[PDB]
Enzyme design. Structure first.
Site, short mmCIF file in Angstrom:
data_model
loop_
_atom_site.label_atom_id
_atom_site.label_comp_id
_atom_site.label_asym_id
_atom_site.label_seq_id
_atom_site.Cartn_x
_atom_site.Cartn_y
_atom_site.Cartn_z
N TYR A 28 -4.37 -6.13 2.70
CA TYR A 28 -3.68 -5.04 2.90
C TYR A 28 -2.45 -4.76 2.44
O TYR A 28 -2.05 -3.57 1.85
CB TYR A 28 -4.15 -4.13 3.93
CG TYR A 28 -5.70 -3.78 4.14
CD1 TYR A 28 -6.57 -4.87 4.72
CD2 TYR A 28 -6.24 -2.55 3.68
CE1 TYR A 28 -7.70 -4.65 4.74
CE2 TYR A 28 -7.63 -2.62 3.71
CZ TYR A 28 -8.31 -3.50 4.49
OH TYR A 28 -9.84 -3.48 4.37
N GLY A 30 0.10 -4.46 0.12
CA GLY A 30 0.11 -4.43 -1.62
C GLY A 30 -0.54 -3.13 -1.80
O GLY A 30 -1.31 -2.33 -1.19
N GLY A 32 -3.44 -1.11 -2.87
CA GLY A 32 -4.88 -1.32 -2.72
C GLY A 32 -5.18 -1.79 -1.26
O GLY A 32 -4.25 -2.09 -0.49
N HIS A 48 -1.07 1.65 7.57
CA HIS A 48 -0.18 1.98 6.51
C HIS A 48 -1.12 2.85 5.62
O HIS A 48 -0.72 3.90 5.17
CB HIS A 48 1.07 1.23 6.14
CG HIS A 48 1.95 2.11 5.13
ND1 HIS A 48 1.96 2.19 3.92
CD2 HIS A 48 3.02 2.85 5.49
CE1 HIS A 48 2.84 2.80 3.49
NE2 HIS A 48 3.52 3.28 4.39
N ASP A 49 -1.73 1.98 5.05
CA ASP A 49 -2.97 2.46 3.95
C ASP A 49 -3.44 3.76 4.39
O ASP A 49 -3.54 4.89 3.61
CB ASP A 49 -3.87 1.28 3.43
CG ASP A 49 -3.08 0.20 2.75
OD1 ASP A 49 -1.95 0.27 2.50
OD2 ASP A 49 -3.70 -0.59 2.26
N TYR A 52 -1.39 6.83 4.53
CA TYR A 52 -1.12 7.40 3.36
C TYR A 52 -2.26 8.07 2.75
O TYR A 52 -2.04 9.11 1.88
CB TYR A 52 -0.78 6.20 2.28
CG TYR A 52 0.76 5.93 2.17
CD1 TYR A 52 1.69 6.42 3.24
CD2 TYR A 52 1.22 5.57 0.74
CE1 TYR A 52 3.08 6.35 3.11
CE2 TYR A 52 2.86 5.58 0.75
CZ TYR A 52 3.71 5.89 1.94
OH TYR A 52 5.07 5.60 1.87
N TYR A 73 12.39 11.31 1.25
CA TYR A 73 12.46 12.04 2.77
C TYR A 73 13.59 11.70 3.18
O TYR A 73 14.57 10.92 2.80
CB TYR A 73 11.33 11.65 3.75
CG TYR A 73 10.88 9.87 3.77
CD1 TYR A 73 11.77 9.23 4.39
CD2 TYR A 73 9.80 9.42 3.26
CE1 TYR A 73 11.86 7.86 4.62
CE2 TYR A 73 9.71 8.11 3.28
CZ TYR A 73 10.85 7.45 3.89
OH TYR A 73 10.50 5.81 3.95
N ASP A 99 5.79 5.42 7.22
CA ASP A 99 6.66 4.35 6.70
C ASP A 99 7.35 3.45 8.05
O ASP A 99 7.48 2.54 8.12
CB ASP A 99 7.78 4.78 5.92
CG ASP A 99 7.08 4.97 4.34
OD1 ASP A 99 5.92 4.89 4.21
OD2 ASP A 99 7.99 5.15 3.33
CA LIG Z 1 -2.22 -1.60 0.71
#
Ligand SMILES: [Ca+2]
Ligand SMILES: CCCCCCCCCCCCCCCCOC[C@H](COCC(F)(F)F)OP(=O)(O)OC
EC number: 3.1.1.4
Length: 131
Positions: A28, A30, A32, A48-49, A52, A73, A99
């Site tokens: 995960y 990177g 995708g 984190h994916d 988002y 931000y 983040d």
């Molecule tokens: Ca990812």
């Protein structure tokens, strides 16, 4: 924004080189992601994916921000402590937090060199039903 995420990571982890260290790590970390995270660090990236994914569905983000990596931000860094400034609007605050949490998670997880540059087509099949 992407340059800010790199900066947050360096805040939490002095001496790190975010693109070299975390991009293209596990299943995960990177662009995708798929399969089952190979470790704690990889789970940080899956989270984190998901964050988002959630950010893109937020009202304040919906049409203004299609890709959170283009949305800047307000934040500050002091003694490896990250702070998402109150001046951030709903959409900016959500992203900064995604983040920030990722950066902290990264700093507390073990780093497994053998999980770097993983052959995702061989070790990241299937889809994790998490977050
Ligand atoms: Ca990812
Ligand atoms: C290509 O960008 C994808 C992104 C790269 O992150 C590397 C950084 F240096 F910014 F830490 O991976 P993502 O899975 O979104 O987050 C780790």
């Amino acid at each position: 924004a992407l340059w800010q995420f790199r900066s947050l990571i360096k805040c939490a982890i002095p001496g790190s080189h975010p693109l070299l260290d975390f991009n293209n790590y596990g299943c995960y970390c990177g662009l995708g992601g798929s399969g089952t995270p190979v470790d704690e660090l990889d789970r940080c990236c899956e989270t984190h994916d998901c964050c988002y994914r959630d950010a893109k569905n937020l009202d304040s983000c919906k049409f203004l921000v299609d890709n959170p990596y283009t949305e800047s931000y307000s934040y500050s860094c002091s003694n490896t402590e990250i702070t998402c400034n109150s001046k951030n609007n709903a959409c900016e605050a959500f992203i900064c937090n995604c983040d920030r949490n990722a950066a902290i998670c990264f700093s507390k997880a073990p780093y497994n060199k053998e999980h770097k540059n993983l052959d995702t087509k061989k070790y990241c099949k299937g889809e994790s039903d998490k977050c």
